[PDB]
Structures are given as C-alpha cells and as structure tokens.
Amino acid sequence: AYMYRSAFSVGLETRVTVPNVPIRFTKIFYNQQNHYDGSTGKFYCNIPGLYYFSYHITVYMKDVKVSLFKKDKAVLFTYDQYQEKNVDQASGSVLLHLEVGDQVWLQVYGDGDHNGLYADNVNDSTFTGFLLYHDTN
Amino acid sequence: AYMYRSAFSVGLETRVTVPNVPIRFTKIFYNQQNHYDGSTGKFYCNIPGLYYFSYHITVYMKDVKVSLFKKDKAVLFTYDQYQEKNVDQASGSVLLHLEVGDQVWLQVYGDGDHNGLYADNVNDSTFTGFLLYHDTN
Amino acid sequence: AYMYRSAFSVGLETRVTVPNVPIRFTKIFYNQQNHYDGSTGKFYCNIPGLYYFSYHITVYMKDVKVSLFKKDKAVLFTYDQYQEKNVDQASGSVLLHLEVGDQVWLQVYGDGDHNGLYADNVNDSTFTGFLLYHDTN
Questions:
Q1: CATH architecture for the domain at B1-137
Q2: Which of A46, C48, C76, C110 has the CB geometry, 3.0–4.6 Å to C135, for a possible disulfide?
Q3: Which of A103, A115, A128 lies closest to A15, judged by CA?
Q4: Which among A50, A79, A93 has CB closest to B126?
C-alpha cells in the first residue's frame, strides 16, 4: 500500500573546493527513492509538499558564501562572518514547499586560488532532506 | 479532509542586535497555518504534540547567549565559547512536546553597545519548527 | 489505536571531557518511548524505519573528533578544523535507516589531559532523533 515518501541524506567526506556549481555529494546515507542524483548533486521533487532540508558542510577556500538553491535561485544564503583561514564550516536548515520538478541543491562561492596546505580531513559534510507533509488531495 | 499540520520556517537576512526580546523573523520561507506570528516573533502551538525546532542565527554583539523559550522560560541555552570579533553564530535543534497555547521563540542576550563596523551581510538566520506527532486522541 | 512512534531529544548542559565512550546525555527534553537510555547514553531502535538524527555538542579538549555510531561503527566523522581554546563545538544531522536492535550514539576523541581553566558554561549540548518513516509492512 503505497505511501508518499521522499528523503535523502548524502555526504562527501571532503573535497568541496569547486565554486559556482552544484555540490555533488556521492556518499549515500540514504536515497531509497533515488530522488537525489549524485551525478548532478541535485534533489528532484517527485512529490508536492513541505520538505525539510538540512546541511553541514566544510568548504576549503577563502571568503566563502553558501547558497541553498531551489529551482533556479538561492532561497537560503549563508555567509559565516566568523571565517578563519581558508576553511569555512556552514550549516543551515529550512522548510520549503516544493512542486514536482522543483530542484534543490547546494552551491558555494569563494576564492580557492590561494589555499594553503591540506590535511588529514576525513570530515563528513552532509546534505539532507525529507518530505514532511504531502500536498492537499 | 483535515490533517493535523503545523510548521513554520522564517528568517531575517540580518537585524538581530536587540537582546532580551523575542527575535522577530519576518522573512517567510513557510508559515501556511500562520501559527508563527512575525509581529511578536513567537510560534503559537495550536495542536498538541511533539514538535521539532531548529535554528541557525547570527548575532551581532559580544558575550552572546542564545535562549529558545517555551511558554515563559528558556528550555535551551546556548553560550558558544567560540566567540570572537563580536559575531556569534549559534545553532540548535530540540524536540519539545507542546500543548495548545504554548509559545516558543528565540531570544538573545549580550553587549551591543560597542559593536565595530558592520559589513555587506546578506546572511540568512533561520528559525524552523514542525509538528512531528499529534497527541493521543 | 497504536501509532509507530519513536523520538528522543536529550542534553547535558556540560561535562563531555571523556573520549572513546558513548556520551551519556541525562537532561531529557523528550524520551516518551524510553528508546534512549541515559545509563548507556545510547538510542535503541525498537521500530524499523528511517530516522533523522541531529546533534549540537560542545567538547572540552584538543584535536577533537566527533563520531556518530550506528550499531558498532562510526557513520559520521566530524573533525572541525577551526578548533581553538581546547573547545570544539560540533553539529551534524543525518538520516539513518535502522532495524530493531540497532544502537546509535555519539562519541568523541581528543586530548583532554591538559585543558585550560573552565568557566561558567551552562551550555546545552543536544542529541536528538526521531522515526520519520516506519518500515514497509
């Protein structure tokens, strides 16, 4: 007996250094409905309703700005004013009503043409989302 | 066909500098049931049950302490020790069981009578909450 | 009528200084089904399904690494790079599918043998989780 379900939880373990593009998380904690696509780093709404989104990422670059995108524009914009060195750790959560076809993803902005020396890492960056409430009916 | 639903997600983009008062988030990501009131900055429970709350805010002041209030007292107290440059970015999440009429809001405390020069900003601070489980019945 | 429900939200206020062991949160914001055991500091899955987990903790030690465990292995590994003052404030969220018997808990690692002088504190660290989707049936 079918139930309107949609959720995904994905990570990176590190590498976030490319700006202006959708961050493509490939570590899958959960993506049963395959509504999230690691090839594009985008979540595709296949069920209209209220979704909850949450992310915790580590960005390796200077003056980092994080944007959570819905459809084609930034709906959430993070600019941690407490950025030290060339590493930024941003997080956020929000509820977004989505229609079928609506896309949601994360994107970073900043300078990485002058990054110091890397390190061990093994630090999980995550992007999660799930359908809270299915629309009308 | 009615369903016990209650959720809200609101932000500010910036303005939080006044302490001791409910932070009035006015940017509405979601507030369909209008259980959140931007005039008071408080969420009003209209359905008894278990609620999840989550916030990510940036506070412009020193020696900042953040409190999530339920009814009339702080249930969550955040005093990040990682403060420096008079810019505190506190976050938190918790599950609270609420009864009809219970109010929930965020409140900050600190010294804002010696803040340096501002900046571009454009940094979303958010307050989100949703009914997870409706009570008994 | 029975509803497959399972959620918990617990905190500490301060203490986390001992590494390698499951953090025992004892402040109960919610633990109605008693699925979280404050004695062992572990959540026990009593209902198979999709769970959302969220945590915001403050660790008092140096070179702090944080791990969210599922059953016996670390699922999430948080190694905040912007650490200082021997105080690490880590947070994370993720969705995990669990089977009955599966245990989930938080554990920290790091050097706490030589920490500086404490302070007021009163800083709520939290560990929360809830069943999102009950399994098949």
A1: Sandwich (2.60)
A2: C48
A3: A115
A4: A93
Whether C80 and A93 lie within 8 Å, measured CB to CB: no
Q: Domain spans of chain A?
A: 1-137
Q: Answer whether B128 touches A (CB < 8 Å).
A: yes
Sequence-ordered list of residues with C-beta below 8 angstroms from that of C60, at least 6 positions apart, any chain: C16, C17, C86, C87, C112, C115, C118
The torsion region of residue A38 among left (phi > 0), alpha (psi -120 to 50) and beta comes to: alpha
B1 at A interface, C-beta within 8 A: yes
C-beta contacts of C115-120 below 8 A and 24+ residues apart: C115/C17, C115/C60, C115/C61, C115/C62, C115/C86, C116/C85, C116/C86, C118/C60, C119/B81, C120/B79
Name the experimental technique.
X-ray
B10 at the C interface (CB within 8 A)?
Answer: no
Q: Cβ-count burial of A17 within 10 angstroms (0-12 exposed, 13-18 middle, 19+ buried)?
A: middle
Q: Give one DSSP letter per residue of B19-71, joined into a string.
A: -SSB----EEEE-TT--EETTTTEEE--S-EEEEEEEEEEEESEEEEEEEEET
Interchain contact, A97 vs B123, CB within 8 Å: no
Q: Do B30 and A97 touch (CB under 8 A)?
A: yes
d(CA C137, CA C128): 26
Q: Can you give the resolution of this entry in Å?
A: 2.1
User: Six-digit token pair at A75?
Assistant: 């709906």
Contact by Cβ (8 Å): C130, C6: yes
